[PDB]
Design an enzyme around this catalytic site. Structure first.
Site, mmCIF file in Angstrom:
data_model
loop_
_atom_site.group_PDB
_atom_site.id
_atom_site.type_symbol
_atom_site.label_atom_id
_atom_site.label_comp_id
_atom_site.label_asym_id
_atom_site.label_seq_id
_atom_site.Cartn_x
_atom_site.Cartn_y
_atom_site.Cartn_z
ATOM 1 N N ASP A 49 -40.080 -19.552 68.136
ATOM 2 C CA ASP A 49 -38.864 -20.082 68.751
ATOM 3 C C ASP A 49 -39.057 -19.170 70.066
ATOM 4 O O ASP A 49 -39.750 -18.681 70.438
ATOM 5 C CB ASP A 49 -37.824 -19.971 67.993
ATOM 6 N N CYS A 52 -39.249 -15.270 70.131
ATOM 7 C CA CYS A 52 -40.674 -14.748 69.485
ATOM 8 C C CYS A 52 -41.042 -13.355 70.078
ATOM 9 O O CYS A 52 -41.160 -12.145 69.537
ATOM 10 C CB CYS A 52 -41.680 -15.688 69.644
ATOM 11 N N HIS A 254 -46.464 -16.727 73.440
ATOM 12 C CA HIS A 254 -46.143 -16.432 72.151
ATOM 13 C C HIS A 254 -46.733 -15.165 71.431
ATOM 14 O O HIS A 254 -47.957 -14.856 71.900
ATOM 15 C CB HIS A 254 -46.640 -17.520 71.333
#
Ligand SMILES: [Ca+2]
Ligand SMILES: [Cl-]
Length: 260
Positions: A49, A52, A254
């Site tokens: 999300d 992260c 990410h």
């Protein structure tokens, strides 16, 4: 709720699942995980999300905590929301994920949890506790509010330092050079308020995060494998006494966590 940092698995098993086929990108990713695997055996997949980067960094930092850092010991930390918000009324434009009470609650929680992890006598006890904290409930997201606030505070300090003609780290020049982030209020409205909501941290904000929590963040940047940025450390030249957390970023968006 369910864990937001998945149980560990073997890193090369993870790679083999994710990166199949013969493309150049897949090959680079494999080489990157092979490099990580020289030092770490396993990986924990961090929920992807908009929090992260914060989740990855904080999980690492807290799971490794064997002491409560001085910045979290400082009584001034709990007084900071009232002083900052009273001084800078534009902080009331904060988008939550009164305001002084809420931020103070979040900082109190961060300190309490960190102190409790540091007290624990076994590293397994610490991992159990720290897993329970990252179970997608209000407490987890309260930690992020605290960290975001610390980022804002550090940015205000750096901006004010630059205004007084004091030496600042160059990343802060780059942070405020962005046309959507020329000052702390722009940083709040256009960047920090979006974090956890519509976007995650940008590169220059990873330096801000590192400064905010006084941890050195060592990132394997797999999209940078065949370059000197294959690892980037945030900040470049931290105090020797800042603890180190290691992360993996496939594409600078990410972050996942290597473990051993
Ligand atoms: Ca275990
Ligand atoms: Cl499989």
């Amino acid at each position: 709720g369910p864990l937001s940092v998945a149980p560990e698995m073997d890193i090369m098993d993870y790679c083999k699942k994710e990166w199949r086929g013969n493309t150049q990108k897949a090959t680079c990713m494999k080489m990157g995980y092979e490099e990580v695997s020289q030092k770490f055996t396993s990986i924990r997949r961090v929920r992807g999300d908009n929090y992260c980067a914060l989740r990855a960094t904080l999980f690492q930092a807290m799971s490794q905590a064997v002491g409560l850092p001085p910045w979290l010991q400082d009584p001034e930390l709990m007084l900071l929301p009232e002083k900052l918000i009273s001084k800078y009324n534009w902080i009331k434009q904060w988008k939550l994920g009164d305001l002084v009470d809420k931020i103070k609650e979040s900082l109190t929680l961060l300190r309490k949890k960190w102190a409790g992890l540091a007290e624990m006598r076994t590293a397994e006890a610490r991992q159990i506790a720290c897993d329970e904290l990252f179970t997608n409930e209000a407490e987890e997201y309260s930690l992020y509010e605290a960290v975001k606030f610390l980022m804002l505070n550090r940015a205000i300090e750096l901006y004010n330092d630059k205004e007084k003609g004091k030496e600042v780290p160059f990343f802060s020049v780059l942070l405020f050079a962005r046309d959507t982030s020329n000052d702390p209020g722009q940083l709040l409205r256009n960047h920090l308020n979006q974090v956890g909501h519509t976007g995650g941290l940008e590169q220059v904000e990873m330096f801000l995060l590192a400064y905010a929590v006084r941890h050195t963040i060592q990132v394997y940047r797999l999209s940078k494998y065949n370059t000197e940025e294959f690892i980037t450390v945030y900040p470049t030249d931290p105090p020797k006494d800042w603890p180190v957390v290691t992360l993996i970023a496939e594409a600078d968006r990410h972050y996942n966590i290597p473990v051993r």
